[PDB]
Amino acid sequence: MTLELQLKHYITNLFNLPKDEKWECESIEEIADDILPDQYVRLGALSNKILQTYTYYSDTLHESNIYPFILYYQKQLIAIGYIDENHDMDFLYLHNTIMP
């Protein structure tokens, strides 16, 4: 809840979205190989490991073509970020990555 609200605050300020809009969440489990960058998956010992993913969606998020997400590996926070308008993965946070 707190991390969700932090992600929401960050995204709404970064893209000038309405602060009061309700966000909904879709949770999906998938191996890191299909989600995270290739070399990051290899160097982070995440190959063939299931990530618990949370993708957030709303009306303005749909109009903005943005998918904010939070990725966990079991109980380890892996990534916080969003897929942008150009279908690229932008990271607010990536485990053991400075300036992702």
Next chain:
Amino acid sequence: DDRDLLLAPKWISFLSLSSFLKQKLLSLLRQIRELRLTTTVYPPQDKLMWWSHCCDPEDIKVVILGQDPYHKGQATGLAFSVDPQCQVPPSLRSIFRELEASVPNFSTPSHGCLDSWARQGVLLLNTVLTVEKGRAGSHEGLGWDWFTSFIISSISSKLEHCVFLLWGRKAIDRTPLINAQKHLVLTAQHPSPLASLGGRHSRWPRFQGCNHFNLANDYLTRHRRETVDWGLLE
């Protein structure tokens, strides 16, 4: 007594559960009721087997596997589907977009209720049928896996010429249950936008462009079965 299984009559006949497996399913349902007494569980009791009430086993044409239900109230009893009042979630949005891109007559609907697919024989089966409110995967260990695997295996062994759309690692884990000599098994990445990005190292084809729905209809026609009208979504 069999009606306590919450399954439609023809589904109870088709699965033909032994007394031991019937007792196991009933114990799991009692677990769900006891959990509901103190916590919120999605979907409601009358929706756990909603797929069995939407169509009979003889009508099954395409089987689409989900994971666990939506954990924030969107779940309806079918995989991926949401109530007509709810927003279309990202994975279902990507499914609808692939349909729009691949099927000519298809137009993206304004809602995400897939009951029309289920009535046509599209089994939208979550592999875990329940989830606790706000807690994704919280029922991973309850014991839904044996039951949904049993449903998949029964469809594989007692029916013929069906199509299985396995998307993502969790759904593809159920590949050994399906007889690929009797049924078509189409495999691709999860439709979630998180799996659609470039620069990854997936082992399965991208979901955008997988054309699984047209390929499923082609398989059904080639075996003299009625196709699925994916466009009926309103």
